[PDB]
Design a protein around this ligand. Structure first.
Ligand SMILES: NC[C@@H]1O[C@H](O[C@H]2[C@@H](O)[C@H](O[C@@H]3[C@@H](O)[C@H](N)C[C@H](N)[C@H]3O[C@H]3O[C@H](CO)[C@@H](O)[C@H](O)[C@H]3N)O[C@@H]2CO)[C@H](N)[C@@H](O)[C@@H]1O
Ligand SMILES: [Mg+2]
Ligand SMILES: [Mg+2]
Ligand SMILES: [Mg+2]
Ligand SMILES: [Mg+2]
Ligand SMILES: [Mg+2]
Ligand SMILES: [Mg+2]
Ligand SMILES: [Mg+2]
Ligand SMILES: [Mg+2]
Ligand SMILES: [Mg+2]
Lengths: 123, 183
RNA sequence: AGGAGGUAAAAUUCU
RNA sequence: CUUACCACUUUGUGAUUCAUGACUGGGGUGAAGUCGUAACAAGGUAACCGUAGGGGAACCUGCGGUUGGAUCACCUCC
RNA sequence: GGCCGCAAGGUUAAAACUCAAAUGAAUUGACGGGGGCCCGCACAAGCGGUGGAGCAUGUGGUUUAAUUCGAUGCAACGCGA
């Protein structure tokens, strides 16, 4: 529009949508499991998807996915939470990291087990 | 006459309380409480029916809870049946006894949970109080149709009270120890 | 060959 | 010793702002529940906008406004 | 929140939250309780039937130790036989 308009009300710029208030923009926060749900995924998919509600460090009560075949944790559990999302089940916005300070890693992983905190068989 | 609604009022009441007892059975306290699982929807290989018809819902301690079973080819089949059922119980497949732990009263549990039972208690009272309302509506009604004597009314309007009062005592004192399972 | 006026009543649904 | 300045603090009374609240209002989302069928074909009463009054619910009804509206074949007369 | 209204409400005007769509015009079909035109024992016009009855035969269900398997609107059911 007018230059005389732009001068008067200059060009706006969208700001941070941030899809993950891990408050201080942190790569991960530490939290306690409020509880450990199971809920069912969005439309075309069907499963029992494992998950936990987690108070962390900064006051935020949130809710995170716990992935991999077979996890083990309960109330007492302090987990480490990292930025994440699951397309099914829209509630989510967060993934629990496997092999951080309490939840443990996946039983009997070999492929891609950096991602599930698993020590090597015996190399 | 009064007779067959004095006994009618009565059954409706002490079966009112035996729903409360029944719905403060589906809560999770600290304590083991096997009647927690002993009212859970579960599938297995043909038809519903609870796990009553399969495993012994026993104990290991106040804070844990063994599941002695017969058949070891449905351990995951029920595990999911239990571990997706509005409780929040992750069962360990330590083998043999599906170890279901009892995570502690987290204080935001000693409270707010407690608030639920003494609310569920209250509505159980209200139901009773309303059996009351009816019971003697029938009384009051069959009076203004001259089939009772004022006296016979009065002695029936109370005594219906005696039924409410006692029936509440059961609600209240069944709640009261159930409160100890956290306080 | 224009205009005119009158000609179908109601009747749902499909992991 | 006193006088002036003045920090801390005090009383009243407004303002402003963040967190919190029984309860409560809608909103969002969640494969297979319950009602009816409002809309899209003329959607079987054209729809829709503003407004107002009704109603389990989609909605219905009046007042104006918009096309972002489907149909001219058969008849009797001219 | 401000301003305006007797009210109904009007005006200025966000946020958390959620989705990977939402939208426009045109295209090809398909549909319409849209319209035009036209066919077929489709109606209409007629003749004799099933549906009732007994029996033959098939099928569903029920039964059974078994009542072997298949065919299920038109286009399965005197069909594979
Ligand atoms: N989803 C958006 C909203 O949907 C609303 O409609 C809500 C309900 O009407 C609708 O419920 C539908 C029901 O309408 C439909 N006729 C039958 C269906 N079983 C229900 O489904 C609902 O419940 C089932 C299980 O109970 C859930 O799996 C599913 O997430 C949910 N859609 O689900 C919607 C909410 O999930 C309104 N259309 C409106 O407020 C808004 O558009
Ligand atoms: Mg229809
Ligand atoms: Mg229906
Ligand atoms: Mg609500
Ligand atoms: Mg309709
Ligand atoms: Mg209409
Ligand atoms: Mg109108
Ligand atoms: Mg012919
Ligand atoms: Mg004929
Ligand atoms: Mg015949």
């Amino acid at each position: 529009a007018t230059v005389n308009q732009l001068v008067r009300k200059p060009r706006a710029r969208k700001v941070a949508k941030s899809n993950v208030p891990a408050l201080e923009a942190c790569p991960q926060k530490r939290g306690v499991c409020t509880r450990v749900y199971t809920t069912t995924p969005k439309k075309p998919n069907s499963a029992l998807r494992k998950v936990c509600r987690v108070r962390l460090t900064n006051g935020f009560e949130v809710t995170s996915y716990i992935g991999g075949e077979g996890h083990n944790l309960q109330e007492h559990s302090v987990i480490l939470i990292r930025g994440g999302r699951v397309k099914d089940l829209p509630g989510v916005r967060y993934h629990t990291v496997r092999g951080a300070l309490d939840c443990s890693g996946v039983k009997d992983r070999k492929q891609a087990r950096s991602k599930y905190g698993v020590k090597r068989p015996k190399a | 006459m009064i007779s067959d609604i004095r006994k009618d009022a009565e059954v409706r009441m002490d079966k009112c309380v035996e729903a409360f007892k029944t719905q403060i059975s589906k809560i999770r306290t600290g304590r083991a409480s096997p009647s927690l699982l002993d009212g859970i929807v579960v599938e297995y290989y043909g038809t519903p029916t609870p796990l009553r018809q399969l495993a012994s819902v026993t104990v290991e301690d106040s804070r844990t809870l063994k599941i002695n079973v017969f058949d070891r080819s449905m351990s995951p089949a029920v595990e999911k049946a239990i571990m997706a059922s509005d409780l929040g119980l992750n069962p360990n497949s330590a083998g043999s006894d599906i170890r279901v732990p009892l995570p502690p009263l987290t204080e935001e549990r000693r409270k707010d949970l407690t608030k639920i039972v003494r609310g569920e208690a209250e509505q159980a009272r209200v139901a009773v109080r309303n059996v009351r309302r009816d019971a003697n509506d029938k009384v009051k009604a069959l009076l203004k149709d001259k089939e009772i004597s004022e006296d016979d009314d009065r002695r029936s309007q109370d005594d219906v009270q005696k039924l409410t009062d006692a029936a509440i005592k059961k609600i209240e004192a069944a709640l009261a120890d159930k409160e100890a399972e956290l306080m």
